[PDB]
Amino acid sequence: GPGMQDDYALIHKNILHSEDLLKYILETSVYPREHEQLKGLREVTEKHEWSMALVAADEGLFLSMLLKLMNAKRTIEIGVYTGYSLLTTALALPEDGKITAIDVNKSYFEIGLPFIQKAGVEHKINFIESEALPVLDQMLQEMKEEDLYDFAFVDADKPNYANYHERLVKLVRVGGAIVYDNTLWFGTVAFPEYPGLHPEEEECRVSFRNLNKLLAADPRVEISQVSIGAGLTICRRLY
Amino acid sequence: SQDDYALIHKNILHSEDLLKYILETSVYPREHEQLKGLREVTEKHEWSMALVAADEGLFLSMLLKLMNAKRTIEIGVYTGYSLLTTALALPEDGKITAIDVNKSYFEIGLPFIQKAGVEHKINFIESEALPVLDQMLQEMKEEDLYDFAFVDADKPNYANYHERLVKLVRVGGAIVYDNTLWFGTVAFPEYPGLHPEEEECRVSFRNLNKLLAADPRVEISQVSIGAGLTICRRLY
Ligand SMILES: Nc1ncnc2c1ncn2[C@@H]1O[C@H](CSCC[C@H](N)C(=O)O)[C@@H](O)[C@H]1O
Ligand SMILES: Nc1ncnc2c1ncn2[C@@H]1O[C@H](CSCC[C@H](N)C(=O)O)[C@@H](O)[C@H]1O
Ligand SMILES: O=Cc1ccc(O)c(O)c1
Ligand SMILES: [Mg+2]
Ligand SMILES: [Mg+2]
Numbered sequence: 001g002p003g004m005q006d007d008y009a010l011i012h013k014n015i016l017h018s019e020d021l022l023k024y025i026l027e028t029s030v031y032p033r034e035h036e037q038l039k040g041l042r043e044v045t046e047k048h049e050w051s052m053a054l055v056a057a058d059e060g061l062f063l064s065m066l067l068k069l070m071n072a073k074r075t076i077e078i079g080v081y082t083g084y085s086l087l088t089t090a091l092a093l094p095e096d097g098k099i100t101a102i103d104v105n106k107s108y109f110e111i112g113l114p115f116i117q118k119a120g121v122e123h124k125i126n127f128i129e130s131e132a133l134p135v136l137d138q139m140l141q142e143m144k145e146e147d148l149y150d151f152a153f154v155d156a157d158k159p160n161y162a163n164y165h166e167r168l169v170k171l172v173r174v175g176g177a178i179v180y181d182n183t184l185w186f187g188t189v190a191f192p193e194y195p196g197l198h199p200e201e202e203e204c205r206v207s208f209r210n211l212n213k214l215l216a217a218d219p220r221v222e223i224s225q226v227s228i229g230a231g232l233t234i235c236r237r238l239y
Numbered sequence: 240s241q242d243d244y245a246l247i248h249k250n251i252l253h254s255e256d257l258l259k260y261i262l263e264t265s266v267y268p269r270e271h272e273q274l275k276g277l278r279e280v281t282e283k284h285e286w287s288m289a290l291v292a293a294d295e296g297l298f299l300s301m302l303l304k305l306m307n308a309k310r311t312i313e314i315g316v317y318t319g320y321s322l323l324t325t326a327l328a329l330p331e332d333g334k335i336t337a338i339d340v341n342k343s344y345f346e347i348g349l350p351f352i353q354k355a356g357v358e359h360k361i362n363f364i365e366s367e368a369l370p371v372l373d374q375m376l377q378e379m380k381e382e383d384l385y386d387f388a389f390v391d392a393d394k395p396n397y398a399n400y401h402e403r404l405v406k407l408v409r410v411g412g413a414i415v416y417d418n419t420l421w422f423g424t425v426a427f428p429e430y431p432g433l434h435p436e437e438e439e440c441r442v443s444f445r446n447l448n449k450l451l452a453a454d455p456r457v458e459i460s461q462v463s464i465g466a467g468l469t470i471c472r473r474l475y
Contacts, residue, residue, distance in 0.1 A: 016463060017253040017423065024426035029461035029469065032452050058461065065460035065470050069306040069413055177305055187253060190260035216268045224301035225265035225294065226464050227252055233265070234301050 001200075002050040002081060003104045003157065009196050010186040013230035014056065030057045037115035038087055044111060045082040053081055055155065055181065056229030060088045063153065063179065066234075067092040070177060072150040076100040078132045078164060079156030079181075083112030089153065090121035099125050100149070102132045103156070132156055136167040148173035155181040158204040161211050165235075169220050174237050178221070183208055184231025240285070244434045246422040247288045251463055258294075266293045273351040274323055280347065281318045289317050291391065291417060295465030296324045299389065299415065302470070303328040306413060308386040312336040314368040314400060315392030315417075319348035325389065326357035335361045336385075338368040339392070368392055372403035384409035391417040394440040397447050401471075405456050410473050414457070419444055420467025 001008075016022050031039070034057060045054045063085060067075070073094055080086050080103040089099055103109055106129040116122045128135055149172045154164055161180055168178050188194040188205045189212065197205065212233070215223050221235040241247065252258050267275075270293060281290045299321060303311070309330060316322050316339035325335055339345060342365040352358050364371055385408050390400050397416055404414050424430045424441045425448065433441065448469070451459050457471040 015252055015257060017250060018426060021251060021420065021423045021426040021463075025420070025461055025463060028448050029452050029459060033459060058463070061460045062462055062470075065458065065472060066302075066305060068411070068458070068472060069302065071306075071411075175304070175307075184257065184261075187257045190254060190256040212264050216265050222301065222304065223265060223269060224297045225261055226298055226462065227258075227261060227294065228462050228464060234298075234305075236301060236304055 002053050002108065005050055005052065007198050008052070008201055009198055010188070010201060011052070013052065013182065013186055015184050015187050015227055015231055025058050030061055033061060035087070035091055035119065037119040038084065038091075041082060041084055041087060041112045041115040045084065048082065048111070050081070055085045059181070059229030059232065060084060062226075062228055064088050064092040066177060066179070067151060070150065072177070073097045074149050075151040075153070076102070076149045076168075076171070077153045077155070078102050079154065080127070081108045081155075083109055083116060085153055085155060086125060087112060087116050087119060087121070089151075090116065090124045091119060093124060097124050101125050101127045102130065102135055103127070104129065104131055133160060133163055133167070136164065136171065140167055140170055143171065148176070150176050152176070152178040153181070154179065158182060158185075159207040161207065162214060165211075165215070165218075169235075169237055172237055174239060176237050178235040178237070180211070180215075180233045180235070182230045183212055183225060183233040184227065186230075241288060244288070244437055245432060246424065246437055249422040251420060251423050251467060261294050266297055269297060271323075271327055271355065273355040274320065274327070277318060277320055277323060277348045277351040281320065284318065284347070286317070291321045292465030295417070295468065296320060298462075298464055300324050300328040302413065302415070303387055306386065308333070308413075310334045310383075310385050311387040311389070312338070312385045312404075312407070313389045313391070314338050315390065316363065317341075317344045317391075319345055319352060321389055321391060322361060323348065323352050323355060323357070325387075326352065326360045327355060329360060331360075333360050337361050337363045338366065338371055339363070340365070340367055369396060369399060369403075372400065372407065375407055376403060379407060384412065386412045388412070388414040389417070390414065394418060394421075395443045397443065398450055401447075401451070401454075405454075405471075405473060408473050410475060412473050414471040414473070416447070416451075416469045416471070418466045419448060419461060419469040420463060422466065
């Protein structure tokens with residue numbers, strides 16, 4: 001989508017039955033706890049032409065909760081867009097935390113950069129403007145035990161999730177977390193066939209159905225599929 | 240009894256097919272065998288609704304491992320699915336303080352927990368948790384604080400359990416409250432057609448959700464998994 005919208009047939013990625021329950025969750029437990037600059041970044045992004053790709057706000061507060069409970073301090077993110085999940089991660093890490101951000105389109109990143117600077121956490125971010133898989137392939141060859149990541153957030157092009165997985169279970173430390181966004185894909189994953197989809201909407205649906213089967217059978221990780229936001233899967237490296 | 244209630248089987252996801260997809264694809268292949276046996280015996284029990292969701296169970300296990308929890312406390316054991324999930328996730332030297340008013344529910348799943356080989360990690364306490372939490376407030380040194388707390392007992396007492404647990408859990412420790420979305424009924428000021436006790440839990444959770452969101456002693460994150468849960472993290 002972004003990097004390669006109204007052509008989509010699916011509109012609401014949140015998988016809940018009630019829009020009133022979703023609004024309740026956001027106004028009761030998210031917006032009161034949402035950073036001032038995360039709010040400004042969100043409102044601007046909701047007016048962008050690819051606003052559907054914006055990470056869910058309740059999904060953002062959850063990622064921040066995981067980063068602190070696991071005391072993550074060196075993370076990597078694949079797929080930044082305007083940087084809501086990047087700013088969420090930067091606010092969650094300690095003062096000397098470091099993030100390796102990767103996106104093919106920096107013009108999306110510069111939409112949220114003013115909010116990242118005014119939040120005072122831009123110093124933690126190393127933005128790489130490139131396709132992620134070439135960067136991950138170099139990282140694995142030059143990999144030292146010292147330079148392992150604690151946490152990986154995958155939110156870029158959807159068909160490449162399985163390929164990203166093979167690199168990230170070597171680039172993330174044992175006991176580290178790998179979180180994949182959109183693993184429930186508008187609920188269309190629960191059906192072998194889903195008519196009425198754009199060709200790449202259907203390609204992402206098939207790729208997630210295959211990815212969810214692969215992750216559930218991968219002994220290198222423990223998995224946990226969480227029905228929050230667009231749906232996400234948490235993988236924890238065992239070896 | 241169980242069929243007097245109206246909210247036993249109301250989903251929060253938009254499809255029963257989507258939930259069944261999650262369980263069959265990502266939960267049952269990763270479910271311990273003793274957790275399967277405990278789950279299938281409990282679904283036949285008179286109070287099968289109180290059993291924690293299986294996708295929720297894997298999620299609690301993931302939290303305990305990522306935060307490297309070692310000493311936890313559970314309030315509301317029932318047959319022990321969340322207890323066996325916790326005891327399976329902690330290191331072999333991990334300890335759990337399990338509290339429930341009903342020892343008879345616990346011994347239903349005790350054979351599965353003994354066959355799983357994790358009974359040595361659990362210290363069950365047959366009592367109301369609120370008198371137990373108060374005695375620990377006077378008896379606990381700073382280095383005995385818990386890393387994790389799972390609240391899943393009588394719902395109108397969550398806010399009272401919270402005041403005790405924000406001082407019994409370590410700084411940076413986690414407190415998880417189950418059913419904080421109460422079958423989706425918390426989204427409305429009024430909700431007709433509910434059992435009186437169901438309506439009482441619904442207004443208690445609407446109060447608790449606003450309480451936890453304004454509690455500066457913790458950071459929160461409400462997660463719409465299973466029946467809905469809220470993760471709190473102690474700040475001071
Ligand atoms: N091949 C690729 N490699 C790396 N990033 C890619 C990519 N293809 C697309 N992307 C990027 O992935 C992003 C997906 S939108 C991601 C939203 C963001 N995670 C948030 O929190 O809101 C887009 O910005 C797009 O530029
Ligand atoms: N005041 C109290 N103190 C401690 N436990 C209580 C309590 N009141 C009720 N309970 C117990 O809390 C349990 C709630 S059902 C909890 C289910 C369990 N968490 C699971 O994984 O399935 C019941 O078994 C009930 O006996
Ligand atoms: O590409 C479309 C898209 C749609 C929703 C998302 O959450 C996302 O990351 C991308
Ligand atoms: Mg996404
Ligand atoms: Mg429960």
